[PDB]
């Protein structure tokens, strides 16, 4: 059957792990557990199509760059995650976007922009400027919350379509 190699990227502590596990395991993980590189498989059905997600979850820390290159090369689609209460994570999004472009030799790579932690009141990054940045890239933007599961199944499924339309 059809496999999709999705890759989840973003700064440390933004909620890539939390996103992936709420998808894989159907619950919220609230505990300290920084990632190195965890990998999950899960066969699902999106729009009638039976398919298999090979999801890679990565480490966001600048120390783990260069180790970035290998998983990018094999990846098919990229969730680029930041936190709406952490603006600095938002500005980091650019660097992942440019690196992903470099390693694969292209400018229109299957990408989705995910803004995580929207359940929070203390939000410093507005929905609009995230939507603006998304359009200027040519890729969708989805607001999710791993705590509540809003937009989660959306955000991953959207990436799949975005791979199919490429």
């Amino acid at each position: 059957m059809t496999e999709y190699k999705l890759v989840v990227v973003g700064a440390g502590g933004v909620g890539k792990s939390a996103l992936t596990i709420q998808l894989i395991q159907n619950h919220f993980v609230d505990e300290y557990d920084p990632t190195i590189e965890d990998s999950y498989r899960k066969q699902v059905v999106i729009d009638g199509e039976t398919c298999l997600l090979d999801i890679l979850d990565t480490a966001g820390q600048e120390e783990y760059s260069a180790m970035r290159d290998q998983y990018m090369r094999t990846g098919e689609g990229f969730l680029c995650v930041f936190a709406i209460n952490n603006t600095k994570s938002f500005e980091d999004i650019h660097q992942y976007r440019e690196q992903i472009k470099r390693v694969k030799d292209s400018d229109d790579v299957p990408m989705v922009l995910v803004g995580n932690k929207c359940d929070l009141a203390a939000r410093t990054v507005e929905s609009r400027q995230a939507q603006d940045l998304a359009r200027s890239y040519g890729i969708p933007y989805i607001e999710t919350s791993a705590k509540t599961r809003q937009g989660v199944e959306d955000a991953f499924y959207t990436l799949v379509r975005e791979i199919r339309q490429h």
Partner: protein
């Protein structure tokens, strides 16, 4: 200009409250790395590494409202740590790691545990065994190097624990985690996945080696955090005996790694010439002058300082 000529500026950078450095940390973004190299050399020169790193980390902590995110993102503080540790804890990494890593390279016994990543008629029980033995061998080497961390770096970890205690008194677990996130997450495990960071190796890992390093660093990271595998990936479940039997050996390490409360200063930096870095720091002020004016507009303790900064920056602008 003559180093003499930066004096008035040089003595505003070093002020204990560290007000300027925080401001800079807000203003930069793409100069983060560059700026770090410049601040560290300045502070290493008049032996204030501790003043800088200790206060800066304390600021990040006092500004953190949720604990499970502490020092996870890429601030200046976490870059300042990064570049400092790469400078002072190289030998440490060679001691703990060099032997265990080189053995892993020359090996051909695969450590794969993942029910899908597995070759045909590959024995996953043989694999588990071999991995565990490496892990045991390695972490024994890691644990018995607690004393190998330079004294001054240990002090700053002590700084880190002093902080987390003043901030979260009711939480006893943080004092170890907060150290683990640097010595493991941001030092040991990276050096495991990529041995050229510290120049342990000079060669590209084989496909089997590359896998084992992830499998090993993943395992070390779980222990370093104190989490059993179980709730995440399924295949990793049989590496837990190791975690359970070393769980406490880790808590010792992380706790006592910061067990220096007196500042060290021997092997002190000889008096030479700073101008090159003071120029380059001033140049980062020029480049962010406007932005620092916006921050100086906000009244408060840093204000008078931030006022004087732009004056000094502009006055040194003119004098060149």
């Amino acid at each position: 200009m003559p180093e003499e000529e930066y004096s008035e500026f040089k003595e505003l950078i070093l002020q204990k409250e560290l007000h300027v450095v925080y401001a800079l940390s807000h203003v930069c973004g793409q100069d983060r790395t560059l700026l770090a190299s410049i601040l560290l050399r300045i502070f290493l020169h008049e032996k204030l590494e501790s003043l800088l790193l200790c206060t800066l980390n304390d600021r990040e902590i006092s500004m953190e409202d949720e604990a499970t995110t502490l020092f996870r993102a890429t601030t200046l503080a976490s870059t300042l740590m990064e570049q400092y540790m790469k400078a002072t804890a190289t030998q440490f990494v060679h001691h703990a790691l060099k032997d265990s890593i080189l053995k892993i390279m020359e090996s051909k016994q695969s450590c794969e545990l993942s029910p899908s990543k597995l070759e045909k008629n590959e024995d996953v029980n043989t694999n588990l065994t071999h991995l565990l033995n490496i892990l045991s061998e390695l972490v024994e080497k890691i644990f018995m190097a607690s004393e190998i961390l330079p004294p001054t770096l240990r002090y700053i970890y002590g700084c880190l624990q002093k902080s987390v205690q003043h901030k979260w008194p009711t939480n006893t677990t943080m004092r170890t985690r907060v150290v683990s996130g640097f010595v493991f997450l941001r030092l040991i495990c990276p050096a495991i996945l990529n041995p050229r960071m510290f120049n342990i190796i000079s060669d590209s890992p084989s496909p089997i080696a590359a896998r084992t390093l992830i499998l090993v660093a993943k395992s070390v990271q779980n222990l370093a955090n104190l989490v059993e595998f179980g709730a995440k990936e399924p295949y990793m479940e049989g590496v837990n005996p190791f975690i359970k039997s070393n769980k406490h050996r880790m808590i010792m390490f992380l706790d006592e790694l910061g067990n220096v409360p007196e500042l060290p200063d021997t092997t002190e930096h000889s008096r030479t010439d700073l101008s090159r870095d003071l120029a380059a720091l001033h140049e980062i002020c020029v480049a962010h002058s406007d932005e620092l004016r916006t921050l100086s507009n906000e009244r408060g303790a840093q204000q008078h300082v931030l006022k004087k900064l732009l004056a000094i920056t502009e006055l040194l602008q003119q004098k060149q």
